C-alpha cells in the first residue's frame, strides 16, 4: 500500500475528513509535517489537536539509543497495568509524580483517553459526595449532579455528553442526564474591571442558585481552566478563587479538566498553577500520551474513596505502556531542557506577535489573547475564519478553527521564534486575500 | 528503579491491588509469564484478561527486522489518526478488513478503549432510531433507551455503567439511566430441550413487554454472545435468534460486545458467527489492541447515519497507532499460522480435560463448559474458588475469577496441549487440597 492509495483504502472502510496529507512518519521532525505523496514540509501550529509537546521525532527520543530498546520491549507488547506492575510502569509514575505532579494531589490514576479520566474524576466526586452525605446523615442516594459551564469541552463519552455543549453535532441525539449548567464570564475585548466583575458575579449567581436548589445533589463543579474548543476562552483568577469558596460552602469538589491546558503549555505544569486555586482533581490527556487525574485535597476527608478501595475504578489495561515509556522520557526532556520557562518566553513573543496583528489590522483581527503558548486570535465571521484557514494551509501552515469564529495556536513547546515568525507572516500574507 | 522496588513506588501514587510479580518484559514469552525478582515462571490462562492473542513476545513479532522498524516508527510519536493519515494506518485497515471483515459490516470505526467502543456503537444506535423515527412520522426525542441482559458486563464508562450488572462495586453511588434489562436464559446442566425453550420464551416475553412499554425509544439491544465477567455463560442460538427476530419487528438494532470473545478465541473470528445470527453493529477490543465498531446492515437504511456524516463519532486520537501496528501483524500471524483452527481443535482437547475432570471430581468440579479456547468451570461455593485459585497461583498457573463460583481459562490461541496438561494437571493437584 502506497502513500498515494492511502485514501483510497481507508476509504473503502470509514469516513475520510482529515488533512489532504499523507504523513511521513519518518521524515517528518520539531515543527514540521512532511506529507509523504509530495515531499512538502507544512508548519504545525496544531500539533496532533495540542497533543504533541516536543513535535515529530524529537532528537532526545530518536539519538537515544537506551531509550530505543525501552520502547520496543514496551511496543511489542500490551500489558493489563491494573493487574501486572513493571519496572517500565513505576519509571513512567514515579517521573510522572516528580515532574507534573502536585503534593495536595498524591493519588494517581491512568487510563486511555482523555474523555474516560474526566468521567474518571467525575466518578470519584460521585463516590465522595455520596459517602461524604451518607457520613453526615444525608441520604447517599444524593450526590450525582455536576455544575459546568456553558461553551465547555470535556470529550464525546456517555457522562462527558452531558457536560460538553460546543457544537450540536458533537452532542444532538444522544441521551443526556440533565445536570446544571451555568453562563461562562470570560475575557473579552472592552470590558473593565467593574464590567468583568459584573459578569462574574452573575456567573455566581447562577451557581450558588443551583446549589440551593438542588441540596446536597451536586457532587462537584468541572471546568477547563481556559476553553479550548469553545473558543480560547480565559477567564480571571477572580472567578475560580470565588468558585473555589463556593464549592467548599456546599461540599461540593472542584475539577479541573486540564487535558488542553495541562503539561507545560501555558507556561507552567499545569494551568490552575497560575490562576491560584487549589483543585480536589485534576483530570489530563493529549501531551501526557497516558491520560488520567491526580486527587487529593477534600479527596482525602472520605477514607473510604475510589482511590483507597479495590475495583471502584478500573479499565483492562489501565493505560497504554508505550503511552507510558514515551511519556517519562518527553517529561525527563521537559525537566533537563526548562522546557516550561521556554514556553513562558516564546508564548510572550507570540502575543506580541498578535497585538502587532491587531494594530496593522484592526477591524479583522479581533481579541489577540493567550497563555504560554496557548495563542488565539478571532476574525469578524466564521466565514472569513474558515477562508484564513484555507488560506494559511495553501501557505503550508496549520492551524486548527476553534468556537465560530477562532484561530488557535498549538506549537509544540520546542518551537523557535524564527518558526513563529514563519507562521505570523504567513498571517500577513493571507489577510488582505480574506478582506 | 529495580524490580524489587516497583510496588513501593506505585504504592506511593496509586492502590496496589495487582498479582505478586513484576513481569519481566523481555524474559516472557508464549504461554508463561517471568517474574523479574524470582526468575519462576508462571503458565499464563490468563493472558491480560484475555487481551492478549499470542501471549508474550510471539516468535513472528520478535524475530521480523522489517517489523521492528514499522513499529519504531509508530511507537515513537502518537498521530491523530482521527485527521492525520498514514501508510501504517492504512494497512491495518485493510488487513483488519480481510482477516476480521465481514461483507456485511463494511464500517470501521476505532478509538481507544473497549467501553468507549460500545459506546460509540450506542451512540451509532441512537442516532440511527432517532433519525429512523423521525423520517417515520415518529418524534425524534424517542430513541434513547438500550435493551440488555442480567450478568452483563460492557465496561465502566457512563454509558456502559447503565448496562454492566455483576458486582456492585463496579457501578454502586454512580449516575445510571433506567435502561430496560431482562433475564439471561443461559444453559446451565440438567436442563433439557424443552426445559431450556420455556426459560428462553421468559426472556422474550421480558424482552416484548419492554419493546411494547416504551414504544419507538428502544434504540437496540447489545449482548455479549457469551457473557465474559459475569461468569462464562452461554446462550443457544435459537435464543439469539429469535432476539433477532423481536429486534427486526421493533425497528431496533442487535448490537454484540465481542470485547472478550473476539478475535478467534472462540474458534471462529467473531462468536456470531458460529451462532448464526447477522448483527448491525459489533463492537470489538481487547485482542484487536485497537478499539472499535463494525456496523452495517440496517445501519445503513439510514443514509445521515453516524458513519456517512462528520463529527458525529471522533476522539482526539482515532486508537493508538501502536497498537495498530501491532496488531495488524497479529493478524497476519493468525492468517497464516492458521489459528482459528488451532484454537477449535485445542479447545475440543481443554474441553475434554475439564469434562473428565468433572467425572472425577462430581461433586467439586461443576458444569464445564466452552467455546473454543473460551473454558471454564464451577465450584460448589466462592470460597472453594478463591481457594482454588490460590492453590493455583502457588503452582505458578495464573486464571481468572468470574463470577461467585467461576474459574475461567483464557489461554493464547497459540497454546500448546502440553501447556493444557499442564494447567490441568495443576488443577487436580489443588482440588483435594480444597475439598
Ligand atoms: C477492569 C474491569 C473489570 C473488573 C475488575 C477486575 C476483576 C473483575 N472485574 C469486576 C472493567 C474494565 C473492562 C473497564 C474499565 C474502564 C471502562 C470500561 C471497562
Ligand atoms: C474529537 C472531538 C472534537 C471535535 C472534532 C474535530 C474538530 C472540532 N471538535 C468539535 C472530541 C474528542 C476529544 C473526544 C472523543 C471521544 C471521547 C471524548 C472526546
Ligand atoms: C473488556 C470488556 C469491556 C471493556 O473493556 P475496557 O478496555 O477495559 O474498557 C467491554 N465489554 C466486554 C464484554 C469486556 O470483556
Ligand atoms: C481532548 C479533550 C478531552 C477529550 O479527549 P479525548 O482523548 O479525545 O477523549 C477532554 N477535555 C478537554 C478539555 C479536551 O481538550
Not at 459517602?131 to 470529550?155: E, M
Not at 476574525?379 to 465560530?404: H, K, M, N, S, Y
Request: aromatic letters at 8%; charged letters at 25%.
Amino acid at each position: 500500500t502506497t502513500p498515494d492509495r492511502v485514501h483510497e483504502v481507508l476509504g473503502r472502510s470509514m469516513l475520510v475528513d482529515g488533512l489532504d496529507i499523507v504523513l511521513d512518519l519518518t521524515r517528518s521532525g520539531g515543527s514540521y509535517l512532511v506529507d509523504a505523496i509530495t515531499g512538502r514540509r507544512y508548519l504545525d501550529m496544531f500539533t496532533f489537536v495540542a497533543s504533541s509537546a516536543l513535535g515529530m521525532n524529537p532528537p532526545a527520543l530518536v539519538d537515544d539509543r537506551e531509550f530505543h530498546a525501552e520502547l520496543m520491549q514496551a511496543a511489542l507488547n500490551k500489558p493489563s497495568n491494573s493487574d501486572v506492575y513493571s519496572v517500565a510502569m513505576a519509571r513512567f509514575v514515579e517521573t510522572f509524580a516528580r515532574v507534573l505532579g502536585d503534593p495536595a494531589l498524591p493519588h494517581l490514576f491512568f487510563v486511555e483517553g482523555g474523555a474516560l479520566a474526566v468521567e474518571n474524576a467525575l466518578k470519584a466526586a460521585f463516590d465522595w459526595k455520596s459517602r461524604h452525605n451518607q457520613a453526615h446523615g444525608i441520604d447517599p442516594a444524593l450526590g450525582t449532579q455536576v455544575l459546568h459551564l456553558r461553551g465547555a469541552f470535556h470529550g464525546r463519552s456517555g457522562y462527558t455528553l452531558s457536560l460538553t455543549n460546543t457544537k450540536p453535532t458533537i452532542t444532538a441525539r444522544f441521551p443526556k442526564f440533565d445536570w446544571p449548567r451555568i453562563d461562562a464570564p470570560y475575557m473579552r475585548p472592552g470590558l473593565d474591571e467593574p464590567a468583568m466583575a459584573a459578569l462574574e458575579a452573575e456567573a455566581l449567581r447562577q451557581a450558588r442558585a443551583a446549589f440551593e436548589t438542588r441540596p446536597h445533589d451536586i457532587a462537584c463543579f468541572v471546568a477547563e481552566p481556559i476553553q479550548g474548543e469553545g473558543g480560547d476562552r480565559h477567564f480571571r483568577p477572580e472567578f475560580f478563587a470565588a468558585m473555589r469558596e463556593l464549592c467548599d460552602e456546599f461540599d461540593a469538589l472542584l475539577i479541573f479538566d486540564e487535558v488542553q491546558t495541562g503539561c507545560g503549555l501555558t507556561g507552567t505544569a499545569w494551568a490552575y498553577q497560575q490562576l491560584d486555586v487549589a483543585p480536589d482533581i485534576v483530570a489530563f490527556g493529549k501531551k501526557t500520551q497516558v491520560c488520567g487525574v491526580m486527587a487529593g485535597r477534600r479527596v482525602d476527608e472520605v477514607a473510604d474513596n475510589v482511590f483507597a478501595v479495590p475495583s471502584r475504578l478500573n479499565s483492562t489495561w489501565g493505560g497504554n505502556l508505550t503511552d507510558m515509556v514515551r511519556a517519562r522520557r518527553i517529561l525527563e526532556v521537559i525537566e533537563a531542557e526548562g522546557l516550561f520557562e521556554r514556553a513562558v518566553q516564546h508564548g510572550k513573543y507570540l502575543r506580541a506577535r498578535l497585538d502587532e496583528l491587531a494594530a496593522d489590522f484592526p477591524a479583522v483581527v479581533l481579541d489577540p489573547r493567550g497563555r504560554g503558548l496557548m495563542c488565539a486570535f478571532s476574525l469578524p465571521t466564521t466565514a472569513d475564519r474558515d477562508e484564513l484557514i484555507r488560506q494559511l494551509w495553501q501557505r503550508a501552515v496549520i492551524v486548527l478553527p476553534a468556537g465560530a469564529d477562532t484561530v488557535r495556536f498549538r506549537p509544540p513547546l520546542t518551537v523557535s521564534t524564527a518558526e513563529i515568525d514563519a507562521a505570523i507572516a504567513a498571517v500577513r500574507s493571507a489577510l488582505p486575500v480574506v478582506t
